[PDB]
């Protein structure tokens, strides 16, 4: 085994980085960009889709977690399979499934079918990170592999910014009407299609063929690589003098057995320690990162809510008689008023409350109302015509000889206003995504100088320390700075992981092990999101404690990992 | 299908007081507006009162408030109609019904289920 | 000059002194006031008060040298008027009646000033029977209206060659064309009494009853109006003088729709939205008064004179509480010092000396409060700064800063206040 890895390292090491490597880099960054775009869609869609699709808060949470659940399943499935059927074929299958289901999700009406489409889209896109990294790792040599793999992490943020830009450039046009959020979904379903388009032109890497006793295809693929790189470097005189490489329903059951064997061989005596260290590291890092990255926007929203409450204005003791009104009201309280023989026509209300009021012989007609209530109010001989007033809008009131006529149809569930303040979401996500650029650059430049282990541990401990500064920012302005700081100072820890997991497992098990670890990452992400979403407003010590302890565990386990810098990839 | 059963009727002396209890046996009881109707001899079922989905707000028909008090207990899974100062006019069969909607309704058609009935004689 | 033209053109000029009404215009004009005619505080003295009965009248007999000046000669009539705010019930019952308050009618051609609901009517009649009439309609906002409980100046000019003009508060409010009319042989007697009025609580206040012998120009009206109102003593919301040891309600002139409320004893004060009354049937709306903190002006050592040192108290739960600024207390921007009520902190000095001055808008009944420290320095004019003190909402906290001194020439400033005492002519609906 090890002898082949020496010979394999020798072939590509001579042809050197060149045309073929950059071509594969771009055509694989397309798949990574597709993943980055996919993980943002449902988030930029909930505020607008919550009206058409009549979405409760429970449905919002389930939709928020469906992408991560699908990504977990897809990572495990496609990683397990790719070690048998190849990397190119499996990536094509998974990306095509993602594109198909993500396109169908745009022309879908019901909530359950939308959830199913999004889950299958996540299953399709789960296997991009493992297959892409493992597959590109087999066209690189050890002198600079770490930097080469680290520049491949840049396309994920490119996809994030693409999704944010399209969301900003499509969703706010609320007057189009099929509204604009479906168009945003369809437009964001494109990079996967381009990924299949650009992936069909690339050979299946020769390492898989060699590991599968298919040295002929390995030789022809290596010949393509050499020919392309030499044609690039303007040295057609050179000849590929390298000789042949060293030689070493039932179908579904056989594939399942082979995948199970690959997975079970990861816990063998050689790889038990490494595998357990990696399980702990991936779990802890994912838990902390996802918990914080979803806790920050929630805190911004809650702090804005407190400001909104502090901006309310109260109107006590108003008496109105024989007056008509058609003027929109917002963020107001009206207490202890009396309205006799009043007509309210074309009235729009938002976050308006009425307490201890009295209505007698009044007349409502065509009233819209969000977060509007009637507490301890009395109605006598009042008529409600074509109104948005539901049963739950009357809290502790009593109505005598009133009437509801032409009751306006629509979603009964409230908090479903077409337009919510989602602009802040787009800009916050855009800044958070840009925060990873300096981290990506420094990590890519210094991975092969500092080393995988040292960079991983340093970034992890720095993030653990930076978490303590959470309490130092209590304003909406400080939370953005903290979000950019945590995101940009922790991204290196992720890159060092992707390079470190790739270089630590045998070529026959690299995709299986990486897929299992990414599935564990997505599971930990789900758990972290769930736990941390219950801390907003409660306090500020709990998130600090949880995310500092988890990153401490991660750094402790990370420091006990082998080193892979300057070692041949086996 | 929620089954509603009424009780507490009978003959009552004029100017007295009486209470009608409507028991429901379905875990899903708090998702309906509970309406009390009455049917007099020769007339139709006329809406009397209704109580919302959380026991906060009531909805009284015309000429009823002052003699009818409607409430609901969500722990005992029941609805209550208290009547007082009963006159000879208030002789009828009282029915209990459920509406699953999000608007208060006085039309008998809009109510989903219906109770058996009780008799009140003055 | 304008003053000379105004003085030489007078034929009748009533004045009250020593509880006696007399003609001080120069021409001897006997005045007979009935026993029931009352005396009330005026603009620069006492004013006649006419209740609706058969004993409250003031008859004036023109001298022989003057009795025919009304025939075909232009003439003007001026006086300060105060009418109670009419109720909605009364406005719906007697909203069409037309009761006269002043009249010179032959006992008959002449002239009359009467009230029809919230309307001021000026009527001219000649021997031929022709009638000219001006019917000015009051404003719908009873807080900023003329036939509300406040004192106003009324001047009616009649030029027999062109027209008749009605001036309120030094401003034209209506006109009529007195052209082709006959001869106004007005009666020798001028009656100041409520006539043909069906309400037993109808009463009006009249002061400075004057008659000029020409059609005064707008400049002359301006000068007369200003001539009365002169900065010597301060006025309340209704135009009456401010008094010591009396409760008042403060209302910012900048935002008349707000009341002043107190958070806690030894804390700050803020502006809240005051209740209001509105009616489209009668077309009247206003902000209901008599709500908020009650304030008391007391001497620092019964009429408040401009430039007087006062202590300001906030009556609260049958207890008074000084308003002031504690030494190095919290402030907005370090110069918008925050006034505190009933402050009592050991070891700290509290500045409680204020000065009641009139620095802006002589025509309006508003007052400014300068606040000085213990070293005679000026902490500044009392006003309102919008802030968020602690975790409380975003309010307008009362302050005392020297910023307002740099904008005393602006159209509207936030340092002016209305002192509103309870009055019987204003009852909320
Ligand atoms: C963070 C980083 O960002 C930087 O941070 C810095 C610190 O904040 C800024 O500095 C700013 O804040 C400084 C504080 O430190 C000074 O403003 C403060 O003035 C203070 C004076 O004590 C007062 O606290 C307040 O003034 C007023 O006070 C009144 C009484 O308190 C009322 O409260 C208000 O008045 C009305 C009103 O006028 O009608 C009432 C009305 O009801 C209300 N509306 C309603 C519905 O209620 C409201 C509406 O606006 C109306 O519509 C009117 O339009 O206004 C208010 O306005 C402030 C106001 C401001 C501007 O903020 C500063 O102002 C100057 C000035 O121009 O006078 C700047 C000059 O050169 C001047 N220097 C010279 C040589 O001449 C200097 C100095 O002379 C001072 O005067 C002291 O002598 O002061 C400014 O810059 C920089 O700009 C900025 O970049
Ligand atoms: C280390 C950093 O931590 C710091 O962080 C903050 C700085 O503000 C905190 O400050 C505190 O917060 C409260 C907690 O103690 C204080 O008391 C309240 O506490 C609860 C809060 O809801 C209430 O439920 C409770 O009911 C009340 N408790 C009592 C006993 O009443 C108090 O809150 C108010 C308030 O009572 O309403 C706020 C509002 O603004 C007022 N106008 C007033 C103004 O704050 C104060 O005047 C400003 O301070 C000076 C000034 O600079 O001028 C300084 C001194 O001169 C003097 N101390 C003070 C006065 O002279 C007075 O003390 C004379 O006795 O003036 O106080 C004060 O702020 C903190 O405690 C302080 O340590
Ligand atoms: C619910 O409201 C009642 C009655 O409201 C009154 O009428 C409204 C138009 C408005 O003017 C309210 O302020 C009035 O109170 C409240 O009963 C009042 O309770 C207070 C305090 O005990 C008492 O001073 C009033 O006289 C009561 N008025 C009446 C008509 O009963 C009652 O407290 C309110 N309940 C809740 C939970 O808010
Ligand atoms: C209870 O209300 C009814 C309804 O009056 C009408 O209800 C709606 C149709 C609305 O659009 C309005 O026009 C009315 O308020 C009252 O019945 C009416 O009573 C008036 C009394 O003048 C009579 O002229 C009408 O013909 C009646 N209409 C009907 C349909 O019966 C009834 O009086 C109200 N009850 C109480 C106690 O006031
Ligand atoms: C579903 C219905 C919910 C119940 C809604 C109840 C809201 C009560 C509204 C109270 C406001 O009442 C309203 O206040 C303003 C002053 O601020 C008054 O003043 C106004 O009157 C006239 C009406 O155009 C105009 O002169 C000006 O607009 C304004 O001065 C109105 O005459 C009164 O009609
Ligand atoms: C409300 O009605 C008034 C009077 O008809 C009209 O001038 C105004 O434009 C209307 N406004 C709206 C928002 O309907």
Q: Which residue do the tokens 């959380």 mark?
A: B54
Q: Of all atoms in ligand 6, which is nearest to the CA of residue A328?
A: 13
H helix intervals, A372-422: none
Q: DSSP letter at B65?
A: B
Q: Give the separation between CA B61 and CA B45, rounded to whole angstroms.
A: 13
Given a contact cutoff of 8 angstroms between Cβ atoms, the answer to whether B8 and B72 are in contact is no
- CA dist list (Å): C375 to A234, C349, C350: 92, 12, 12
Q: What is the CATH number of the domain that holds C409?
A: 2.80.10.50
**Cα torsion through A116, A119, A123, A126, rounded to 10:** 170
| Interface touch B104/A391, C-beta < 8 Å | yes
SS (H, E, C) chain C: CHHHHHHHCEEEEEEEECCEEEECCCCCCCEEECCCCEEEECCCCEEEEEECCCCCCEEEECCCCCCCCCCCCCEEEEEEEECCCCCHHHHHHCCCCCEEEEEEECCCCEEEEEECCCEEEEEEECCCCCEEEEEEECCCEHHHCCCCCCEEEEEEEECCCCCEEEEECCEEEEEECCCCCCCCCCCCEEEEEEECCCCCCCEEEEEEEEEECCCCCHHHHHHHHHHHCCECECECCCCCECECCCEEEEEECCCCCEEEEECCCCECEEEEECCEEEECCCCEEEECCCCCCEEEEEECCCECECCEEEEEEEEECCECCEEEEECCCCEECCCEEECEECCCCCCCCEECCEEEECCCCCCCCCEEEEEECCCCCEEEEEEEEEECCCCCCCEEEEEEECHHHHHCCCCCCCCCEEEECCCCCCCCC
Q: Which of A438, A480, A481 is nearest to A459 (CA)?
A: A438
Beta strands in chain B (DSSP E): 4-7, 10-11, 17-24, 33-39, 45-51, 58-60, 68-73, 78-84, 92-99, 113-114, 118-121
Domain boundary among C176, C194, C228: C228
Q: Tell me, in Å, the resolution of the deposited structure.
A: 3.2
Task: Specify the pairing of strand C10-17 against strand C20-23.
Answer: antiparallel
> Do residue C361 and residue C393 come from a single domain?
yes
Angle between helices A452-467 and A541-559 (to 10 degrees): 160
Closest-CA residue to A67 (of A95, A35, A97): A35
Residues of A in contact with B55 (CB under 8 A): none
Q: What dihedral do alpha carbons B46, B49, B53, B58 form, nearest 10°?
A: 150
C373 and C410 fall within a common domain: yes
Of A311, A315, A319, the CB nearest to C278: A319
- Residues C66 and C27 sit within 8 Å (Cβ to Cβ): yes
Cβ contact C104:C190 at 8 Å: yes
Identify the three-state secondary structure at position A391: helix
CA of residue A326 to ligand 6 center, whole Å: 6
CA–CA–CA angle B51, B54, B56 (5° rounding): 65
Residues in chain B: 122
Q: Which long-range contacts (CB under 8 A, 24 or more apart) does A294-297 make?
A: A294/A528, A294/A529, A294/A532, A294/A533, A295/A532, A295/A533, A295/A535, A295/A536, A295/A543, A296/A428, A296/A432, A296/A479, A296/A482, A296/A483, A296/A486, A297/A425, A297/A428, A297/A483
What does R_g of chain C's alpha carbons equal in angstroms?
24
- Dist CA A267 CA A512 (whole Å): 12
Is C276's CB within 8 Å of A311's CB? no
Q: Name C31's bridge partners.
A: C60
Interface test with B, best of A400, A401, A402 (most B CBs within 10 A): A400
Q: Can you name the residues that pair with A276 across neighbouring β-strands?
A: none
Do residue C118 and residue C214 come from a single domain?
Answer: yes
Quote the CA–CA distance of A242 and A219 in Å, as a whole number. 9
Tell me the C-alpha distance between B112 and B97, whole Å: 7
Are C98 and C114 a contacting pair, CB within 8 Å? yes
Question: Does the CA dihedral A82-A87-A90-A95 come out positive or negative?
Answer: positive
Element (H, E) at A334: strand A329-335
Test site for ligand 3: of A339, A356, A373, most ligand atoms within 8 A of the Cβ: A356
Asked if residue B47 is part of any domain, the answer here is yes
Yes or no: domain A313-405 corresponds to CATH 2.160.20.80: yes
| Distance of alpha carbon A163 from alpha carbon B81, whole angstroms | 58
Residue carrying the six token digits 């309210």: A344
Of A311, A315, A322, Cβ closest to residue C281: A322
Q: Is residue C207 in some structural domain? A: yes
Q: How many angstroms separate the CA atoms of A70 and A124, rounded? A: 8
State how beta strands A329-335 and A343-355 pair.
Answer: parallel
Instruction: Dig out the tokens for A143 from the structure.
Output: 């002198």
> Which residues lie below 8 Å from residue A478, measured CB to CB, with a gap of 6+?
A472
Question: Residue written as tokens 């000059």?
Answer: C1
Torsion of CA A180, A182, A185, A190, to 10 degrees: -90
Q: Residue C322's Cα: distance from chain center in Å?
A: 29
Pairing state between β B113-114 and B45-51: unpaired
Are the C-beta atoms of residues C117 and C36 closer than 8 Å to each other? no
| Tokens read off for A372 | 């509007």
Determine if ligand 5 sits within 6 Å of the CB of residue C386.
no
CB of B97 within 8 A of CB of B115? yes
Quickly count: other Cβ atoms within 10 Å of residue C121's Cβ: 19
**Ramachandran region of residue A434, left (φ > 0), alpha (ψ -120 to 50) or beta?**
alpha
SS3 track for A279-319: HHHHHHHHHHHHHHHHHHHHHHHHHHHHHHHHCCEEEECEE
Residue B93 CB-half CA count within 13 A: 10
**Is residue B120 exposed (0-12), middle (13-18) or buried (19+ Cβ within 10 Å)?**
buried
Alpha-carbon distances, residue A169 vs A158, A184, A185, C106 (angstroms): 16, 9, 12, 84
- Residue A464: CB atoms within 10 Å: 20
Rg of chain A, C-alpha, whole Å? 29
Residue C194 shares a structural domain with residue C251: no
Residues C273 and C224 in one domain: no
Cβ neighbours around A350 below 10 Å, total: 15
Confirm whether B113 is domain-assigned: no
- Please give the structure tokens belonging to residue C328: 């190095």
Task: Determine contact, residues A28/A125, Cβ cutoff 8 Å.
Answer: no
Label residues A33-57 b or e (16+ Cβ within 10 Å = b).
bbbbbbbbbbbbbbbbbbbbbebee
Q: Where in chain A is the domain with CATH 2.160.20.80?
A: 313-405
What's the domain count of chain B? 1
Angstroms from A313 CA to nearest CA on chain C: 8
* CATH superfamily, with its number, for domain A2-304+418-559: MFS general substrate transporter like domains (1.20.1250.20)
Q: Among C196, C228, C260, where does a domain finish?
A: C228
The answer to whether the beta carbons of residues C286 and C87 sit under 8 Å apart is no
CA distance B75 to B67: 25
Assign A424 to helix, strand or coil.
helix
In DSSP terms, C399 is beta-bridged to C338, C383
What 3-state DSSP class applies to A173?
coil
- DSSP classification of residue A460: H
Breaks following residues of chain B (C-to-N distance > 2.5 Å):
none
* Strands C378-387, C395-401: pairing kind: antiparallel
Q: Are C176 and C265 members of one domain?
A: no
Residue minimizing CA distance to atom 32 of ligand 1: C385
Question: What 3-state DSSP class applies to A402?
Answer: coil
* CATH 1.20.1250.20 boundaries in chain A: 2-304+418-559
How many C-beta neighbours within 10 Å does residue C349 have? 13
In this structure, are residues A335 and A357 in contact, taking their beta carbons and an 8 Å threshold? yes
> What distances in angstroms separate CA A396 from CA A374, B52, B57, one per listed residue?
8, 10, 5
The span from the CA of A508 to the CA of C35, in Å, is 122
Instruction: Please give the number of the atom of ligand 2 that sits closest to the Cα of C348.
Output: 61
Give how far B70 is from chain A: nearest CA, Å: 11
At A204, list the tokens. Answer: 């299946």
Dig out the tokens for C407 from the structure: 């904008």
Please count the other Cβ atoms lying within 10 Å of the Cβ belonging to residue C322: 17
Among residues A119, A124, A130, A128, which one has the least CA distance to residue A69?
A119
Instruction: Assess whether the C-beta atom of C425 lies below 6 angstroms from ligand 2.
Output: no
Domain holding C386, by residue range, is 247-420
Q: Is A68 within 8 Å of A528 (Cβ atoms)?
A: no
Judgement on whether residues C212 and C86 belong to the same structural domain of the protein: yes
CATH number at residue B24: 2.60.40.10
Answer whether residue B49 is part of any domain.
yes
Within an 8 Å CB–CB cutoff, is residue A385 touching chain B? no
CB contact under 8 A, B58 and A398: yes
Residue B109 placed within a domain? no
In angstroms, the CA A161 to CA C175 distance is: 71
Going by C-alpha positions, the residue among A444, A469, A468, A465 that lies closest to residue A455 is A444
- Going by the DSSP 8-state scheme, the letter that residue A269 receives in this structure is T
Residue list, ligand 1 pocket, CB within 6 Å? C 254, 332-333, 335-336, 383, 385-386, 399, 401, 403, 414
**Do B57 and A404 lie within an 8 Å CB cutoff?**
no
β-pairing, A373-375 with A394-395?
Answer: parallel
Give the dihedral sign, CA C380/C382/C388/C394. negative
C301 located within any domain: yes
Question: Could you tell me if C300 and C213 lie in one domain?
Answer: no
Residue of B nearest to A408 (CA): B103
Query: Taking CA atoms, what residue in B is nearest to A381?
Result: B62
CB-based contacts of A261, cutoff 8 Å, min separation 6:
none
Domain that holds residue B73: 4-103
Experimental approach = cryo-EM
SS3 for A38?
helix
Going by DSSP bridges, is the β-strand pair A373-375/C258-262 parallel, antiparallel, or unpaired? unpaired
Mutate to test the interface with A, among B59, B65, B72 (most CBs of A within 10 A): B59
Number of domains in chain C: 2
Q: Is residue B5 within 8 Å of residue B78, measured between CB atoms?
A: no
CATH number of the domain encompassing residue C195? 2.60.120.200
Pocket of ligand 4 (CB under 6 A): A 381, 383, 401; B 62
In angstroms, how far is CA A25 from the centroid of its own chain?
22
Q: What DSSP element (H or E) covers A348?
A: strand A343-355
Is residue B63 a part of any domain in this protein?
yes
* Ligand 4 atom having least distance to the Cα of B63: 37
Please indicate, yes or no, whether residues C278 and C415 belong to a single structural domain of this protein: yes
Residues of A in contact with C279 (CB under 8 A): 320-323
**From the CB of residue A98, how many other CB atoms can be counted at a distance below 10 Å?**
31
Name chain A contacts of B52, Cβ cutoff 8 Å: 391-392, 394
């Amino acid at each position: 085994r090890e002898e082949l890895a020496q010979q394999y390292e020798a072939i590509l090491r001579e042809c050197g980085h060149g045309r073929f490597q950059w071509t594969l880099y771009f055509v694989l960054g397309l798949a990574l960009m597709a993943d980055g775009v996919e993980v943002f869609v449902v988030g930029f869609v909930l505020p607008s889709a919550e009206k058409d699709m009549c979405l409760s808060d429970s449905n919002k949470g389930m939709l928020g977690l469906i992408v991560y659940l699908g990504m977990m399943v897809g990572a495990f499935l496609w990683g397990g399979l790719a070690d048998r059927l190849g990397r190119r074929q499996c990536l094509l299958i998974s990306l095509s499934v993602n594109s198909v289901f993500a396109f169908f999700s745009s022309f879908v009406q019901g909530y359950g079918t939308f959830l199913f489409c999004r889950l299958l889209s996540g299953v399709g896109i789960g296997g991009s990170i493992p297959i892409v990294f493992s597959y590109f790792s087999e066209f690189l040599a050890q002198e600079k592999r770490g930097e080469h793999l680290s520049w491949l992490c840049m396309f994920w943020m490119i996809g994030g910014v693409y999704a944010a830009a399209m969301a900003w450039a499509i969703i706010p046009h609320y007057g189009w009407s099929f509204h604009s959020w479906r168009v945003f979904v369809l437009v964001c379903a494109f990079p996967s299609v381009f990924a299949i388009g650009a992936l069909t032109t690339q050979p299946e890497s020769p390492r898989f063929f060699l590991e599968n006793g298919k040295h002929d295809e390995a030789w022809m693929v290596l010949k393509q690589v050499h020919d392309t790189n030499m044609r690039a470097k303007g040295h057609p005189e050179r000849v590929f003098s390298v000789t042949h490489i060293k030689t070493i329903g039932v179908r579904a059951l056989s594939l399942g057995g082979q995948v199970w064997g690959n997975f079970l061989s990861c816990f063998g005596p050689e790889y038990r320690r490494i595998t357990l260290m990696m399980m702990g590291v991936w779990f802890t890092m994912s838990f902390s990162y996802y918990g914080l990255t979803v806790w920050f926007p929630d805190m911004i929203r809650h702090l804005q809510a407190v400001d909104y409450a502090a901006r309310t204005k109260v109107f006590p003791g108003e008496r109105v008689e024989h007056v008509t009104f058609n003027f929109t009201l917002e963020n107001q309280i009206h207490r202890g008023g009396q309205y006799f023989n009043d007509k309210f026509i074309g009235l729009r209300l938002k976050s308006v409350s009425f307490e201890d009021s009295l209505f007698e012989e009044c007349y409502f007609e065509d009233v819209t109302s969000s977060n509007t209530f009637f507490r301890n109010c009395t109605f006598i001989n009042t008529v409600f015509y074509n109104t948005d007033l539901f049963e739950y809008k009357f809290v502790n009131s009593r109505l005598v000889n009133s009437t509801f006529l032409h009751n306006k149809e629509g979603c009964p569930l409230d908090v479903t206003g077409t337009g919510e303040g989602a602009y802040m979401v787009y800009f916050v996500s855009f800044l958070g995504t840009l925060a990873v650029l300096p981290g990506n650059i420094v990590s890519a430049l210094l991975m092969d100088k500092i080393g995988r282990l040292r960079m991983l541990a340093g970034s992890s401990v720095m993030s653990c320390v930076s978490c303590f500064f959470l309490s130092f920012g209590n304003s909406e302005s400080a939370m953005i700075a903290l979000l950019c700081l945590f995101g940009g100072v922790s991204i290196a820890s992720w890159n060092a992981l992707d390079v470190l997991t790739v270089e630590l497992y045998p070529s026959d098990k690299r995709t299986t092990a990486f897929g299992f670890l990414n599935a564990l990452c997505k599971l930990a992400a789900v758990l972290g999101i769930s736990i941390f979403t219950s801390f907003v407003g409660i306090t500020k010590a709990a998130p600090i404690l949880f995310a500092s302890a988890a990153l401490a565990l991660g750094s402790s386990l990370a420091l006990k990992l082998p080193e892979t810098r300057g070692q041949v990839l086996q | 299908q929620v089954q509603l059963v009424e009780s507490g009727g009978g003959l009552v002396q004029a100017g007295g007081s009486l209470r009608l209890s409507c028991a429901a046996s379905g875990r899903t009881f708090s998702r309906f507006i509970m309406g009390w109707f009455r049917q007099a001899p020769g007339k139709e079922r006329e809406f009397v009162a209704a109580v919302g989905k959380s026991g906060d707000t009531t909805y009284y028909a015309d000429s009823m408030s002052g003699r009818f008090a409607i409430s609901r207990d969500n722990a005992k899974n029941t609805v209550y109609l208290q009547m007082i100062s009963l006159k000879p006019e208030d002789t009828a069969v009282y029915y209990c019904a459920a509406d699953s909607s999000y608007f208060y309704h006085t039309h008998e058609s809009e109510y989903d289920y219906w109770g058996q009935g009780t008799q009140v004689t003055v | 000059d304008i003053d000379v033209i105004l003085k030489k053109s007078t034929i009748l000029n009533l004045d009250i002194n020593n509880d006696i009404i007399s003609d001080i215009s120069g021409f001897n004009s006997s005045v007979i006031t009935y026993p029931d005619a009352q005396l009330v505080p005026g603009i620069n003295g006492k004013a006649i008060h006419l209740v609706n009965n058969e004993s409250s009248e003031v008859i004036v007999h023109k001298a022989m040298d003057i009795e025919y000046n009304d025939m075909f000669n232009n003439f003007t009539v001026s006086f300060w008027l105060r009418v109670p705010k009419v109720s909605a019930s009364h406005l719906e019952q007697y909203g069409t009646n037309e009761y006269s308050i002043i009249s010179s009618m032959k006992k008959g051609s002449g002239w009359s000033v009467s009230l029809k609901g919230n309307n001021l009517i000026w009527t001219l009649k000649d021997s031929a029977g022709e009638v000219r009439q001006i019917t000015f309609r009051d404003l719908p906002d009873k807080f900023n209206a003329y036939l509300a409980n406040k004192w106003v100046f009324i001047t009616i000019t009649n030029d027999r060659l062109s027209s008749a003009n009605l001036y309120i508060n030094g401003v034209l409010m209506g006109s009529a064309e007195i052209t082709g009319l006959g001869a106004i042989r007005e009666d020798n007697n001028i009656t100041l009494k409520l006539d043909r009025c069906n309400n037993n609580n109808q009463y009006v206040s009249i002061d400075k009853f004057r008659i000029f012998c020409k059609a005064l120009n707008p400049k002359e009206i301006e000068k007369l109006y200003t001539s009365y109102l002169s900065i010597t003593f301060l006025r309340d919301f209704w135009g009456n003088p401010l008094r010591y040891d009396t409760e008042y309600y403060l209302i910012p002139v900048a935002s008349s729709s707000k009341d002043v409320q107190l958070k806690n004893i030894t804390d700050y004060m803020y502006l809240t939205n005051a209740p209001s009354y509105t009616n489209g049937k009668l077309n009247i709306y206003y902000r209901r008064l008599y709500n908020g903190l009650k304030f008391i002006i007391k001497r620092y050592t019964s009429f408040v004179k401009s430039g007087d040192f006062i202590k300001l108290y906030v009556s609260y739960n049958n207890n008074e509480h000084i308003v002031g600024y504690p030494k190095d207390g919290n402030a907005f921007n370090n110069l918008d010092r925050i006034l505190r009520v009933g402050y009592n902190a050991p070891g700290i000095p509290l500045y409680k000396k204020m000065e009641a001055v009139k620095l802006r808008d002589l025509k309006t009944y508003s007052v400014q409060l300068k606040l000085y420290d213990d070293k005679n320095a000026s902490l500044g004019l009392v006003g309102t700064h919008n802030g968020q003190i602690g975790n409380d909402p975003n309010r307008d906290i009362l302050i005392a800063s020297n910023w307002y001194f740099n904008h005393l020439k602006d159209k509207i400033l936030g340092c002016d206040w209305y002192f509103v005492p309870t009055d019987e002519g204003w009852t909320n609906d």
